[PDB]
Amino acid sequence: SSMSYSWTGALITPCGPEEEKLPINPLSNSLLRYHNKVYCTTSKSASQRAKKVTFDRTQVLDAHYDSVLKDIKLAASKVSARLLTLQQACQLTPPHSARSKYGFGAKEVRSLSGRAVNHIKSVWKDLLEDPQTPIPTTIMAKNEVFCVDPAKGGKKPARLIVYPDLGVRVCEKMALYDITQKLPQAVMGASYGFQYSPAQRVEYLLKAWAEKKDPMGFSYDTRHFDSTVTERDIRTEESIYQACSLPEEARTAIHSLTERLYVGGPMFNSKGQTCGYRRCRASGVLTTSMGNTITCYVKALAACKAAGIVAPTMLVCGDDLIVISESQGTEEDERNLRAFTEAMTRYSAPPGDPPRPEYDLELITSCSSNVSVALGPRGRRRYYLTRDPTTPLARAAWETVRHSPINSWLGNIIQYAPTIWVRMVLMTHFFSILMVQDTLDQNLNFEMYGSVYSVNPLDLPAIIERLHGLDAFSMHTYSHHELTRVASALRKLGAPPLRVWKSRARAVRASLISRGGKAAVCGRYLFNWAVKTKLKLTPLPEARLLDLSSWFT
RNA sequence: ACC
Numbered sequence: 001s002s003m004s005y006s007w008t009g010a011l012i013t014p015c016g017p018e019e020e021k022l023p024i025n026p027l028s029n030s031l032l033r034y035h036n037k038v039y040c041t042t043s044k045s046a047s048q049r050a051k052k053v054t055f056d057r058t059q060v061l062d063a064h065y066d067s068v069l070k071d072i073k074l075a076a077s078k079v080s081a082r083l084l085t086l087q088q089a090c091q092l093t094p095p096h097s098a099r100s101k102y103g104f105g106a107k108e109v110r111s112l113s114g115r116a117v118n119h120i121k122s123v124w125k126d127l128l129e130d131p132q133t134p135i136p137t138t139i140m141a142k143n144e145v146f147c148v149d150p151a152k153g154g155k156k157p158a159r160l161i162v163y164p165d166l167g168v169r170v171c172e173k174m175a176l177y178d179i180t181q182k183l184p185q186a187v188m189g190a191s192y193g194f195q196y197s198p199a200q201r202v203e204y205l206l207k208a209w210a211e212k213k214d215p216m217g218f219s220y221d222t223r224h225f226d227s228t229v230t231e232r233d234i235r236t237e238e239s240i241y242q243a244c245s246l247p248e249e250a251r252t253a254i255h256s257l258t259e260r261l262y263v264g265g266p267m268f269n270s271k272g273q274t275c276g277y278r279r280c281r282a283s284g285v286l287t288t289s290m291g292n293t294i295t296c297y298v299k300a301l302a303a304c305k306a307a308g309i310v311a312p313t314m315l316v317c318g319d320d321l322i323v324i325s326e327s328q329g330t331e332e333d334e335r336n337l338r339a340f341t342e343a344m345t346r347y348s349a350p351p352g353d354p355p356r357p358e359y360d361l362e363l364i365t366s367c368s369s370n371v372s373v374a375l376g377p378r379g380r381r382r383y384y385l386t387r388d389p390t391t392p393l394a395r396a397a398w399e400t401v402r403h404s405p406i407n408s409w410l411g412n413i414i415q416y417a418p419t420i421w422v423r424m425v426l427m428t429h430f431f432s433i434l435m436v437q438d439t440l441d442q443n444l445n446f447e448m449y450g451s452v453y454s455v456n457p458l459d460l461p462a463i464i465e466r467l468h469g470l471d472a473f474s475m476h477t478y479s480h481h482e483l484t485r486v487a488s489a490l491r492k493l494g495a496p497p498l499r500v501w502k503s504r505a506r507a508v509r510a511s512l513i514s515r516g517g518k519a520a521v522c523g524r525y526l527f528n529w530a531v532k533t534k535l536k537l538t539p540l541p542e543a544r545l546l547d548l549s550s551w552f553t
Numbered sequence: 554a555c556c
């Protein structure tokens with residue numbers, strides 16, 4: 001039995017000055033009017049979060065768990081992984097990664113400066129030689145943007161981010177980067193959710209649904225997952241990494257990282273003051289995503305067995321889970337789900353919201369998204385991935401000296417291209433703004449899973465065809481759920497309604513077309529929905545030539 | 554902060 005955290009009373013402090021909202025939002029004040037509703041989480045609310053994630057865990061495992069873990073270790077044993085060289089690990093450091101306390105930053109790391117390389121040499125040697133001394137961490141509040149929600153308390157408190165010095169972060173990669181690239185896929189196979197594009201995720205869920213004689217589905221998410229992860233879960237994570245075939249030196253670093261960093265340690269705020277002690281997942285270590293996903297998978301698969309879920313097909317992404325299985329009748333389904341939740345709760349993975357069984361695929365939300373349905377160019381049902389557009393619209397209106405929301409618009413257009421809210425609202429706004437700026441042909445960054453991809457706005461039609469298919473330009477007759485949710489979100493943020501967007505889009509389309517070239521292709525393909533007499537849209541040659549593999553894997 |  002253990003407390004997730006203990007605290008000294010020292011504040012969780014900010015890094016520098018927190019971003020200020022301005023009196024005019026010139027890029028987004030034609031998108032929506034209720035800018036008062038759009039806020040960024042700050043260190044100010046960090047103490048409120050701290051309180052909500054500090055609690056006593058008392059975990060109890062059973063034979064279901066023991067049996068699943070056994071099978072996972074076995075599957076792990078088929079993996080061979082290597083150390084990264086110090087230098088390879090250095091080059092995987094993101095360009096703005098928070099600098100070391102020891103006199104260098106990401107720039108020096110990525111260029112293999114001598115002082116940075118030498119410091120990292122001594123960090124690595126010290127990991128091989130001291131398997132015990134706790135490694136210090138910094139605790140920080142995440143800054144992210146949401147729309148106020150009266151129901152859910154108004155403003156969400158900032159999540160807590162916990163990470164070690166840059167020098168240690170490089171070492172983590174040396175020991176574990178290769179494992180992060182191989183282990184989840186080896187132990188989960190098709191259940192590993194991170195490997196799928198939106199269309200592929202959709203295809204997978206539909207496939208799973210059609211395979212059952214009488215399907216039932218549900219989603220699950222753990223409340224404050226990192227805080228629920230126990231010291232023992234983390235040692236079990238090690239035992240799973242150690243089941244791979246590894247060179248001896250990696251075994252030793254992995255063990256030291258586990259005991260000195262991953263299982264816990266002292267936390268300092270940005271001012272250097274002792275803040276607390278952690279006995280749970282540090283979100284910010286290399287193993288955050290792999291560890292979350294695997295430990296979620298272990299618990300959830302064991303809980304399925306404990307609950308009597310028949311013929312489970314799982315999709316797991318971090319602490320986000322969908323299970324599609326054979327219905328045993330709604331009465332047993334409901335009982336089985338309570339047993340599932342009970343087992344997860346024993347396993348120290350308690351729910352934010354209790355799960356419930358569903359028998360219609362539209363009604364299952366996971367990873368903030370859900371499958372919906374519309375009609376394609378030949379009048380066939382077409383399934384696609386959508387989500388509540390509230391957060392995307394709020395982020396679309398985050399505009400400060402330090403931050404442009406244009407990249408946000410782009411990321412949503414790519415990921416959610418077939419949706420009614422992207423097609424009618426975000427595409428219309430994006431193209432209008434860039435045209436008026438005369439920056440249509442300037443490349444933008446599309447950010448995904450921490451990676452960044454340079455995209456030209458005028459290549460979107462090819463990109464969208466490749467990622468979502470040509471159907472993405474002719475979806476119509478969207479679902480009641482989706483029409484309702486979109487209209488409501490637009491009202492809530494003070495944006496024009498869909499019919500006004502349709503009028504704006506007509507004019508955006510005509511302006512694009514009038515420019516000829518790739519712009520006119522954007523107009524014809526991306527806004528064929530806006531005109532009375534549809535055009536016949538044919539496969540784009542450039543789309544065949546595209547390889548977008550890495551974007552969603 | 555990590556993916």
Ligand SMILES: O=c1ccn([C@@H]2O[C@H](COP(=O)(O)OP(=O)(O)O)[C@@H](O)[C@H]2O)c(=O)[nH]1
Pocket residue numbers: 142159221222223224225226227281283284288292318319320
């Ligand atoms: O910016 C983020 C968001 C989430 N997570 C990790 O993913 C887990 C699940 O996140 P979720 O969105 O379900 O929120 P939580 O379960 O933390 O309340 C977290 O506990 C973190 O370990 C993270 O590392 N960074």
Ligand SMILES: [Cl-]
Pocket residue numbers: 375376377378379380381
């Ligand atoms: Cl069709």
Ligand SMILES: [Mn+2]
Pocket residue numbers: 221222223224225319352
């Ligand atoms: Mn969660």
Ligand SMILES: [Mn+2]
Pocket residue numbers: 221222318319320
């Ligand atoms: Mn989650």
